[PDB]
Design an enzyme around this catalytic site. Sequence first.
Site, mmCIF file in Angstrom:
data_model
loop_
_atom_site.group_PDB
_atom_site.id
_atom_site.type_symbol
_atom_site.label_atom_id
_atom_site.label_comp_id
_atom_site.label_asym_id
_atom_site.label_seq_id
_atom_site.Cartn_x
_atom_site.Cartn_y
_atom_site.Cartn_z
ATOM 1 N N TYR D 155 28.237 -16.609 73.029
ATOM 2 C CA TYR D 155 28.309 -17.182 71.671
ATOM 3 C C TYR D 155 28.926 -18.571 71.742
ATOM 4 O O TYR D 155 28.640 -19.448 70.924
ATOM 5 C CB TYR D 155 29.086 -16.261 70.732
ATOM 6 C CG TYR D 155 28.850 -16.543 69.277
ATOM 7 C CD1 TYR D 155 27.560 -16.483 68.734
ATOM 8 C CD2 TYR D 155 29.921 -16.876 68.426
ATOM 9 C CE1 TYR D 155 27.329 -16.756 67.387
ATOM 10 C CE2 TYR D 155 29.702 -17.146 67.072
ATOM 11 C CZ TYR D 155 28.399 -17.077 66.564
ATOM 12 O OH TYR D 155 28.174 -17.325 65.243
ATOM 13 N N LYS D 162 32.133 -21.682 64.050
ATOM 14 C CA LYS D 162 32.376 -20.689 63.021
ATOM 15 C C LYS D 162 33.844 -20.677 62.620
ATOM 16 O O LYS D 162 34.163 -20.564 61.430
ATOM 17 C CB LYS D 162 31.926 -19.303 63.483
ATOM 18 C CG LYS D 162 30.413 -19.097 63.529
ATOM 19 C CD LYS D 162 29.750 -19.457 62.203
ATOM 20 C CE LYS D 162 28.308 -19.044 62.167
ATOM 21 N NZ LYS D 162 27.707 -19.376 60.843
#
Lengths: 57, 57, 258, 253, 253, 258
Positions: D155, D162
Amino acid sequence: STIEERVIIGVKQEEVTNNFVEDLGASLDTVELVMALEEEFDTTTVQAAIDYINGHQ
Amino acid sequence: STIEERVIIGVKQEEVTNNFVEDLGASLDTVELVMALEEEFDTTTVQAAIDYINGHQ
Amino acid sequence: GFLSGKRILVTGVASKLSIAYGIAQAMHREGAELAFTYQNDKLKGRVEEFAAQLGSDIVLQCDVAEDASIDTMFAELGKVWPKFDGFVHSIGFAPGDQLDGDYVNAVTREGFKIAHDISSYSFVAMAKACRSMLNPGSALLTLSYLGAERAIPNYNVMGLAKASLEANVRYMANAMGPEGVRVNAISAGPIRTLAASGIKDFRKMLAHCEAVTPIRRTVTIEDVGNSAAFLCSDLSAGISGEVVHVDGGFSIAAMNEL
Amino acid sequence: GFLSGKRILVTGVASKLSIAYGIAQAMHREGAELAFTYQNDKLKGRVEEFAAQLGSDIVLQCDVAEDASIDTMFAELGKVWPKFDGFVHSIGFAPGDQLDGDYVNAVTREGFKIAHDISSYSFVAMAKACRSMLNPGSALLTLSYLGAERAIPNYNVMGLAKASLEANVRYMANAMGPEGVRVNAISAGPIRTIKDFRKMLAHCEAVTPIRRTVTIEDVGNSAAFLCSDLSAGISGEVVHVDGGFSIAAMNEL
Amino acid sequence: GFLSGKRILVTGVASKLSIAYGIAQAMHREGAELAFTYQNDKLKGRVEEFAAQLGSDIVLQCDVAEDASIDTMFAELGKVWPKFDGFVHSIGFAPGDQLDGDYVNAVTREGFKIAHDISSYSFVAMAKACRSMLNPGSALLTLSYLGAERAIPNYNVMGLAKASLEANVRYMANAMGPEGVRVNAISAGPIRTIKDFRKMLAHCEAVTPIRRTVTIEDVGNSAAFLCSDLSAGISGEVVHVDGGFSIAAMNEL
Amino acid sequence: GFLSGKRILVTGVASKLSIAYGIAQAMHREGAELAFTYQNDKLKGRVEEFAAQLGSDIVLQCDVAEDASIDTMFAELGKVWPKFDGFVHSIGFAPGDQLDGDYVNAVTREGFKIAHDISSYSFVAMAKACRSMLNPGSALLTLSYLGAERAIPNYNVMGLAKASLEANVRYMANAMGPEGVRVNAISAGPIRTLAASGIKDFRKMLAHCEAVTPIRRTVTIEDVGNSAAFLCSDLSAGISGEVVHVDGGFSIAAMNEL
């Protein structure tokens, strides 16, 4: 406890055919197996339940 | 800068009547006030803008 | 001392009354050999005095803005140190108009790019540049602030950048863990400085914060220095990917006439 | 329904399987009037189909990397909705190389720059563009992921983006709160949206407290709630809609 | 409404100003059928009035300190609802001396014991009692406060109790999840429910992002959402319904 | 060492391969004078051997279940130490049927009372008992586990008790801060022990956890000991009301083939 009867060696009694990682289903699960059999004998498949651990000691 | 004109000393020019904590609104807000007036003179109410800081030095 | 045997690169030292100097000071005190970096050329003076005062000849220009400059710096640092034990990231910046009033108003795409590039990406850039110089048992450390976790007036886009930095810590610790590098952060309370001793807003602020911090004072550069030293020592071998709060308890209290 | 009387702009509708679609569908069901945006001409027709299935024909070109695009789009929406009630932000991107393998190896200055620009900055970029259009009682919503809060393999730079986004929620909530705007995020669990993901999901259903993964329906409903007046007491929050996955640990064992 | 078809037990209704009342009212509005409990005979009549204003006449005696009371109450509810869809847990208590002054001074073994027993244990005590009554899709909800997460003056041993309660939510969610039950909490902001609290609230409205405190309406609506099928993707969560108060810091300055 | 001058009471030492022994060991190593407590009478043996091996004559029975016993213990400890520098809370217990399977099933009101009284209230009870013995610059420390913050199978009501304990930390730090006492916790990763080396479930567990912990091993009693020592030293003056994670990064990672 015969050669087949003794070799201790998670599986159902019947499913555990004298015929470890593949079919029999006996990462680290297979390691503690040797350690346990090594203690009671004080010495790919499930073939060593007869081959390696009868002639040797 | 007269005795009333000099004594530097948060308030609106007009609201700041020569008449600090109560009415005039001049915990630690009142402390830095002395420190600032102490520097430019090198020496309850807003009475000391004339009384204490004219006779003394 | 408990850093005896460690070589630690130390970034952003530019003043004695500062977190970064407090860190270097405490690390030298603990018997760590040190190196330093400096920004523009018109700073080599002060930094060289600071370094010398802490037993170090190793002073090196660097501008994390540019990948080039980071590789250069590490190639150079390579000469004296072929393989070291970690660094302290004390780098953070936002174009000054970003920290002024309403964040939605203040923020811009440019303000965002710089703040994140400088305050968060720089941390990983330097990790990429010296990955293979870093010994087992190494440790990296960056500096963060409550503004990452809560909305604090004026701190604006820095909060976002700090949050990025705090995640970087987590991800870095997870990538670099397998080859024996611990990565961590200190989230530091506010600290009295000439700068903060030069604004009634900050002065009355730091005073109010003192009243509501559980230990009843602001932490000191010394307090931060000690925690930092520890976080880079083998004493903190158990700790990685953590953001340690070093703010005397401020963040864990609420409505303390807050 | 509890959104009747509201006008909501929805970004990120790209297929009937999109999270953004489950959101728009829930809001339509609950009485909202909708408007949608599209990235580039290729997808125009598709979105137009979707907009129509959901009671709307307001469909505006937008590319959030460009300040001008954003500004244009809100100008155009201006004509129809001189004042709307918020938007849903379902936009995330990072150059594909960023998202594979060791994070420190994969990450680069450009990747990092793009990720945070599109995934995080675009959220406030849009708020900025339409601040004076928003009514009191408006609500803004973005989509996030546990990679913000925890290191998840591959990720990579998206985690940081994020994380920046979730902080953005908080600073935006605090800024816009005084003029009656709320701002929140959903952190959605993985959704069954290359044995890479088939095993992952299977183990997932087994350790998630609700014993399944979440659907775009589950997300859509929570999204609809958070943009309605029912969530009037909730702001600056990151709500986990992952059936409890993230509050469980070592449940393999 | 989105609760139509659901049966929900509501505890803690004691006045029309109760959080529990705002919850029950929101659920009634949204189509739920309700049942209520009361502490002791003194309050019986009052609750009966309230139950009736909210479409219900199921009203059961319960004292959660006693295992037997809890067990009886669910037996009785058994007759009417052999199977319901969850309950709302709005019960918190700590002997009054616990809640004033220095925490280490104030706290005692007995206080601590009572607080955690009533405020935290009673939540799972009730789940235990009605586990086999709950349908798949059930949802349980308790009420919590920021004192769980942060040291707040005078809140003292209640903080610890609430902290225990929020962990309880998570372990309950994880246990009951496999048989279709969800479990969550709302952490409500202070509600204008002795200059002690008049100034506190005033400064509160000023630092809370939405610039007011939350009402039992705001809480009620969030509560109704969390007990409905709209929140199907949410479990083990502590949702902050405090207008963003807790994600803001040093906003005096 | 960095604890030179400190007198630290140390609770729950009962075995060398243990967090509590690792703490005492590291604290003695850092030049701290130590005292110890023990539960039932049939333990004074081992504990006295442990204490002696770490330069201490001060061994004292205690049963935190009872307020009486805590005051007695501190009145006694008063004789040799009229005023000390803090203690280490390593006490936690749940009636064994609580930790077995489904938590809603397993838990009972009784299991709840004990677990919370022993694992959480004991911490504050001991703080109440020695408040006025505690010097400025004191520090208290307790031990916690990830089970406070996440639902972990079998850990059951201990999670709730640990969460209580973690809040106790916050509140204690806020009450006792004004008179110079810092209060903190370590949330420790799992640790190999004879006990854990005696169950295939735990053995295969600890092995799996090792694979997914960022630093690629479980922390050691030594790792915990160091962090503990630090958290009680004046090096951690900046830190109060914090729960430090000492688990090699385990908790900050997810889906690591977890």
